[PDB]
Amino acid sequence: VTAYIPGEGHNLQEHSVVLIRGGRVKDLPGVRYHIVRGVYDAAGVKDRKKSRSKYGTKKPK
Amino acid sequence: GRYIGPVCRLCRREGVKLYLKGERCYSPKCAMERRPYPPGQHGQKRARRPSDYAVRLREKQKLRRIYGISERQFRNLFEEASKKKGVTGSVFLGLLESRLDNVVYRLGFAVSRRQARQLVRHGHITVNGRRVDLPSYRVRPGDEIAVAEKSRNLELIRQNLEAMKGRKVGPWLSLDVEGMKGKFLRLPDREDLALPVNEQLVIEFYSR
Amino acid sequence: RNLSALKRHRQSLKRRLRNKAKKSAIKTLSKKAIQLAQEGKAEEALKIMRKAESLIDKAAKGSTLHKNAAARRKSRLMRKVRQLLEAAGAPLIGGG
Amino acid sequence: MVKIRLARFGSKHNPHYRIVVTDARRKRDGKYIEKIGYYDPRKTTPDWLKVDVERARYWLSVGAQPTDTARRLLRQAGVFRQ
Amino acid sequence: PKKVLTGVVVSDKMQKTVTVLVERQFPHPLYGKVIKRSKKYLAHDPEEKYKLGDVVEIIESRPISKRKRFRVLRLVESGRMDLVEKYLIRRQNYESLSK
RNA sequence: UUGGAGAGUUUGAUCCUGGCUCAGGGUGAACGCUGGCGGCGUGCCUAAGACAUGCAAGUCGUGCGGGCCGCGGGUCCGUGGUCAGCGGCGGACGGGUGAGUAACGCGUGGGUGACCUACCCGGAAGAGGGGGACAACCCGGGGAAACUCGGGCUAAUCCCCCAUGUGGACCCGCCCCUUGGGGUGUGUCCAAAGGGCUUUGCCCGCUUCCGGAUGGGCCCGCGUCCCAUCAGCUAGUUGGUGGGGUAAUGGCCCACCAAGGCGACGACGGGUAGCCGGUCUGAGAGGAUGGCCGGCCACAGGGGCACUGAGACACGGGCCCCACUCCUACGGGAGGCAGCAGUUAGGAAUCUUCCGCAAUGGGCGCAAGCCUGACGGAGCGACGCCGCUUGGAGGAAGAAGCCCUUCGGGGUGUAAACUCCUGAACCCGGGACGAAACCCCCGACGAGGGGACUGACGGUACCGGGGUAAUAGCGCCGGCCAACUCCGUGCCAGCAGCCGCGGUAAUACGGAGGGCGCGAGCGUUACCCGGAUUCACUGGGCGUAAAGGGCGUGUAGGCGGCCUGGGGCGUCCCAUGUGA
RNA sequence: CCUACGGGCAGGCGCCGAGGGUAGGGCCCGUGACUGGGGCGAAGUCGUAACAAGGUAGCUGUACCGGAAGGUGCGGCUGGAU
Numbered sequence A: 001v002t003a004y005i006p007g008e009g010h011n012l013q014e015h016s017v018v019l020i021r022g023g024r025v026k027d028l029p030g031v032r033y034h035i036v037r038g039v040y041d042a043a044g045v046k047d048r049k050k051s052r053s054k055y056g057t058k059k060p061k
Numbered sequence B: 001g002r003y004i005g006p007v008c009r010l011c012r013r014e015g016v017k018l019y020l021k022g023e024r025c026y027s028p029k030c031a032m033e034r035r036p037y038p039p040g041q042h043g044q045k046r047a048r049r050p051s052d053y054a055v056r057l058r059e060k061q062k063l064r065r066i067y068g069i070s071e072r073q074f075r076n077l078f079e080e081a082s083k084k085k086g087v088t089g090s091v092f093l094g095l096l097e098s099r100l101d102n103v104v105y106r107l108g109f110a111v112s113r114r115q116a117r118q119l120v121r122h123g124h125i126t127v128n129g130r131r132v133d134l135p136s137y138r139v140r141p142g143d144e145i146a147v148a149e150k151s152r153n154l155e156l157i158r159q160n161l162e163a164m165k166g167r168k169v170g171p172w173l174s175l176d177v178e179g180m181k182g183k184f185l186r187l188p189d190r191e192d193l194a195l196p197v198n199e200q201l202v203i204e205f206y207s208r
Numbered sequence C: 001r002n003l004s005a006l007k008r009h010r011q012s013l014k015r016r017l018r019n020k021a022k023k024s025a026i027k028t029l030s031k032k033a034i035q036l037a038q039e040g041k042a043e044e045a046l047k048i049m050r051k052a053e054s055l056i057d058k059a060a061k062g063s064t065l066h067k068n069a070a071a072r073r074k075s076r077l078m079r080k081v082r083q084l085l086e087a088a089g090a091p092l093i094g095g096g
Numbered sequence D: 001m002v003k004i005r006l007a008r009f010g011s012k013h014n015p016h017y018r019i020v021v022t023d024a025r026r027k028r029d030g031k032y033i034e035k036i037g038y039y040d041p042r043k044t045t046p047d048w049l050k051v052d053v054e055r056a057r058y059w060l061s062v063g064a065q066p067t068d069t070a071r072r073l074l075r076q077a078g079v080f081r082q
Numbered sequence E: 001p002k003k004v005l006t007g008v009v010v011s012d013k014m015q016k017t018v019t020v021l022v023e024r025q026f027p028h029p030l031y032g033k034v035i036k037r038s039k040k041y042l043a044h045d046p047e048e049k050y051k052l053g054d055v056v057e058i059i060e061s062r063p064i065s066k067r068k069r070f071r072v073l074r075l076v077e078s079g080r081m082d083l084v085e086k087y088l089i090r091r092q093n094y095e096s097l098s099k
Numbered sequence F: 001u002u003g004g005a006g007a008g009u010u011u012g013a014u015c016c017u018g019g020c021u022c023a024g025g026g027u028g029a030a031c032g033c034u035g036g037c038g039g040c041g042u043g044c045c046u047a048a049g050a051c052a053u054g055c056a057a058g059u060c061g062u063g064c065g066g067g068c069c070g071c072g073g074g075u076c077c078g079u080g081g082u083c084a085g086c087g088g089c090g091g092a093c094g095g096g097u098g099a100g101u102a103a104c105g106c107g108u109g110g111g112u113g114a115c116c117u118a119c120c121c122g123g124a125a126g127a128g129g130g131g132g133a134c135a136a137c138c139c140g141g142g143g144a145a146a147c148u149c150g151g152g153c154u155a156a157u158c159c160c161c162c163a164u165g166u167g168g169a170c171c172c173g174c175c176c177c178u179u180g181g182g183g184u185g186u187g188u189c190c191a192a193a194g195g196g197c198u199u200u201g202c203c204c205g206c207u208u209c210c211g212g213a214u215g216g217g218c219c220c221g222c223g224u225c226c227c228a229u230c231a232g233c234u235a236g237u238u239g240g241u242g243g244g245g246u247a248a249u250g251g252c253c254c255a256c257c258a259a260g261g262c263g264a265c266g267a268c269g270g271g272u273a274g275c276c277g278g279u280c281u282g283a284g285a286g287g288a289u290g291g292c293c294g295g296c297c298a299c300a301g302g303g304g305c306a307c308u309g310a311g312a313c314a315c316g317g318g319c320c321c322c323a324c325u326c327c328u329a330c331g332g333g334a335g336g337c338a339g340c341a342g343u344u345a346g347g348a349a350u351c352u353u354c355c356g357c358a359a360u361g362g363g364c365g366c367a368a369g370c371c372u373g374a375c376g377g378a379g380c381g382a383c384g385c386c387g388c389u390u391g392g393a394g395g396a397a398g399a400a401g402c403c404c405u406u407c408g409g410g411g412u413g414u415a416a417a418c419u420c421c422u423g424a425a426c427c428c429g430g431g432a433c434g435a436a437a438c439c440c441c442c443g444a445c446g447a448g449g450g451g452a453c454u455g456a457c458g459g460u461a462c463c464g465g466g467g468u469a470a471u472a473g474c475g476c477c478g479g480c481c482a483a484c485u486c487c488g489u490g491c492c493a494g495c496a497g498c499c500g501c502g503g504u505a506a507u508a509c510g511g512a513g514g515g516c517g518c519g520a521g522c523g524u525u526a527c528c529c530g531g532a533u534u535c536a537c538u539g540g541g542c543g544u545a546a547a548g549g550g551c552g553u554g555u556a557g558g559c560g561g562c563c564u565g566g567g568g569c570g571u572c573c574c575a576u577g578u579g580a
Numbered sequence G: 001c002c003u004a005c006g007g008g009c010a011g012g013c014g015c016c017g018a019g020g021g022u023a024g025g026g027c028c029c030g031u032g033a034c035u036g037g038g039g040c041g042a043a044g045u046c047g048u049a050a051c052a053a054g055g056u057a058g059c060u061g062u063a064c065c066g067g068a069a070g071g072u073g074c075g076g077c078u079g080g081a082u
């Protein structure tokens, strides 16, 4: 299937190993699942500050 | 753990003076007396009509913040009430009251409940003899809530006990002052305290 | 890689042997008897019939035949002998 | 045989036996034939042993055999004083 | 007790055996209404003495054959061929339910 | 009568219909960000895929005869041990798992005149005389091992025969009975084993029989999921006679005879599933569900089989076929973790190759005692619930920093600083309950009294004394829904559960300040119930919203007028058993 | 071979039997050159069939036809303006 990559900017390319979760994207028909950032070869959003667990981004100092 | 943070803002949001501080609460330095408007950048703005939801939230938070208690332990108690025989508010209020740490501050050994815990906690309190360092203890009719003998002789409790010689406290309670001992005689009728809170409203918040 | 569970097995072999042996014996004699009483030959069938009945019941004693089995084996035996002889007759021994 | 013994209830470091007449080969905390009294070895109560002595003797009559440590809590319950 | 049932013989066509059609009413667990269900029993008739129409009692009995676990207790009433015809037509009516 | 809340979205607006959506509770969970403590639970839901090493079932010298070593010390006899053997009883319990199974499998109530039951208990009787085998051992032949073949010796609670016959078994007759129940008469048939001490008597044993209890076997009524786009099924099929078989009924099996049995009350077929106690939810009715604990069932690499036995068609017993795997000396042979751990694979994902028999319980044993990955505990994992912490009192008309600002001030904020009080952690000493039985003493091995031994957890819990201010995180702030402002972006980047936000003034994107909610947790995804009276029994509907069959005729079925009477099936009442 | 000799054991034959093999059928899943429509997109092309008497009232069952919506016949319905 086809899955959405949430967040600003991603390190995904062909062969990237990925974890998915349920939940469509109302506006992209056929996208019915989401990629979990911060799991396997899909990394978190560099620089998120707000709502980070949802974008797999660790906590900054 | 429990709330443990800025504590004046609570009243300021809840609109009423909740006596969470013990002493300062009576000086005109009290947060409420200086600013009787809600915390933060927007307290000074012409507040908008609060929704029924709003209404009941605040009222519960109010009743909760009063005892500085975790939402769980709060909920359970409510639940313990909703099962239990009688009228829910009573029992909820009644049960809430029978919490040692509260019952410690009630018989006045402390100025804040928030301080009364630290006592209950650090072992400085006891019941019918044995020491009890668990603030959630459900104090029951008959109990003797002494101060730990090996704590009778302490500055912090000396002060607090003394301002209590001639204080009238609770139709449901007694106090051999100077001996530093008290009695839980009964759970309040609602009359017995008039906390600034329509607890019917709290039932309604949960029944949603 | 072992046990005296083996021991327990070794025995089963030998016990088995005893059983099977005593058990066939029955059949031979028992039926030899039914045989006679068919061609009866009355007296003999009764002679044999007993040497059956003893062996049947001597099985019954142990772990070979169960009791009711000996009983079962007996009832059917006698009925056959009798009713066979009863189509010629009559008994020169017992029982009965 | 049918037996008479301690089927543990309670919880970790909080023993609490039910003395039961169970089939020798039932599991220890298993289906029993009949409960006949309890027993608390930590002793933390007014009565930590009641023992339907009239029943315990029935089973005793009609065959049952108690454990070692169940015989005693029946001696202690006076089931043998004649 | 040994369960006893009351029903009509609908088939005599076996030797030393008859088919006894028991019925019952029982109110429907959810929808309330009293509803009917019936069942056939192969009933033991050592004397081949019961006939069609015969409304009889049968009793839970020691197993006679695979499927015969009842002996015919007692004649209760003769000649209700009006019943036999009930069942019989229902059966007949089935030829029409194929495809 | 302890129990019942709704909201968003079809329009310019309305009412109605109707779907989609959310807030609630839940879980053997998993994912993210973060993570201090303690207790009680709990933790391969996927591959019933594959498994290295260890461990999970044994014990009795008070059944017997020997080997090796030792203590007594005249080849010997004793005593102890130890090794196997012969003989016991156990190994069918306990532990595991859910593959199969829509079934008398399970649940519930019943039947058995159709039945069995080791060790236990109660009671009646009893144990006389012979005779024999086989291992161990000695002797030879085979191998790397697994081991093994042949020959001879010998004990016993091993085997067999005779005797005795309370008794019991069986044929026939008869009486009561009424499915094969009980009694009896004639015929017939069957018992046995000894061991140890204090040695004219106990005790553990052995035998036949009766009853109890206990665990079962079998049988019947009622209940038990989806598809009728599965409608017809059936030759051991359905019934009979006769046999065989079994503890016992039974086409369970066989021979013969008859032509029967089953199905819209859903046969047959296909799909899914172990069932219940319970669990989750719900006002209830309902819906969902069967992990943990308890009960029953089923399987033990896939299959078939029976042996021994009271009981198995036997997880760590046997045989054989298959599949895979290893071993080696290349000749041959060995395996069965759905036991406890553990490895690997698979997966989003589920743990220590721990500790001990102290308890409890089980096996053997007179007892001592041995075995016990059952079990009691410890280990790991915020997996769940519960309790505890990161402090408490004081402290400015209010610091710096940062945010807003109409440039006056507003905000974080008593928050901080700083003051004093307490004292999680750590240090120090003490240190359990769980353990009183078995045993020994006296009593009589009984009643009873008396003494003693024994703790994995654990030097832990907890008691006492000294003592340190000592982790905070996460979601969210357009409406539903509690929480608002600046900046950057400019139909981009992005957000998104639904309605919808972004086209240079965005409370809806991103950071910030501020705010709301929870707090060693917070959020996400998945699934279940709920909101959904949205399958409606409770508690909906069909003129136009989705929905009356094109119309007759009619089978089964559902339903049915006034009066009287019998029965009493539904219905109603009480009692009573069951509802672990 | 044992004797326990009217017997037992070996051993032999048979039934049945795991499965294996030969042959022929039933169902189900996966997949296939090519192919038929369907949903969606949309920022295109062609026309404008329906909603107004929608510019030929409309809808309809059927039959025949046409790039396409559609048209026409026969019958029916008003859920048709005047």
Ligand code: SF4
Residues within 6 Å of the ligand: B007, B008, B009, B011, B012, B017, B018, B019, B020, B021, B022, B024, B025, B026, B029, B030, B031, B032, B033
């Ligand atoms: S001071 Fe006034 S506001 Fe601040 S806590 Fe005491 S009472 Fe509440």
Ligand SMILES: [Mg+2]
Residues within 6 Å of the ligand: A014, A015, A016, A017, A041
């Ligand atoms: Mg890569």
Ligand SMILES: [Mg+2]
Residues within 6 Å of the ligand: A022, A023, A024
């Ligand atoms: Mg979703």
Ligand SMILES: [Mg+2]
Residues within 6 Å of the ligand: A051
């Ligand atoms: Mg967001």
Ligand SMILES: [Mg+2]
Residues within 6 Å of the ligand: B017, B018, B019, B195, B196
């Ligand atoms: Mg107040």
Ligand SMILES: [Mg+2]
Residues within 6 Å of the ligand: B018, B019
């Ligand atoms: Mg107050």
Ligand SMILES: [Mg+2]
Residues within 6 Å of the ligand: B052, B055
């Ligand atoms: Mg209001």
Ligand SMILES: [Mg+2]
Residues within 6 Å of the ligand: B081, B082, B083, B084, B085, B086, B087, B088, F002
């Ligand atoms: Mg109430």
Ligand SMILES: [Mg+2]
Residues within 6 Å of the ligand: C004, C007
């Ligand atoms: Mg052995």
Ligand SMILES: [Mg+2]
Residues within 6 Å of the ligand: C028
């Ligand atoms: Mg022969």
Ligand SMILES: [Mg+2]
Residues within 6 Å of the ligand: C063, C064, F309
């Ligand atoms: Mg046998």
Ligand SMILES: [Mg+2]
Residues within 6 Å of the ligand: C059, C060, C061, C062, C063, C064, C065, C066, C067
């Ligand atoms: Mg026998």
Ligand SMILES: [Mg+2]
Residues within 6 Å of the ligand: E064, E065
């Ligand atoms: Mg028959």
Ligand SMILES: [Mg+2]
Residues within 6 Å of the ligand: F001, F003
């Ligand atoms: Mg009510």
Ligand SMILES: [Mg+2]
Residues within 6 Å of the ligand: B208, F005, F006, F531
């Ligand atoms: Mg609601």
Ligand SMILES: [Mg+2]
Residues within 6 Å of the ligand: F009, F499
């Ligand atoms: Mg809209």
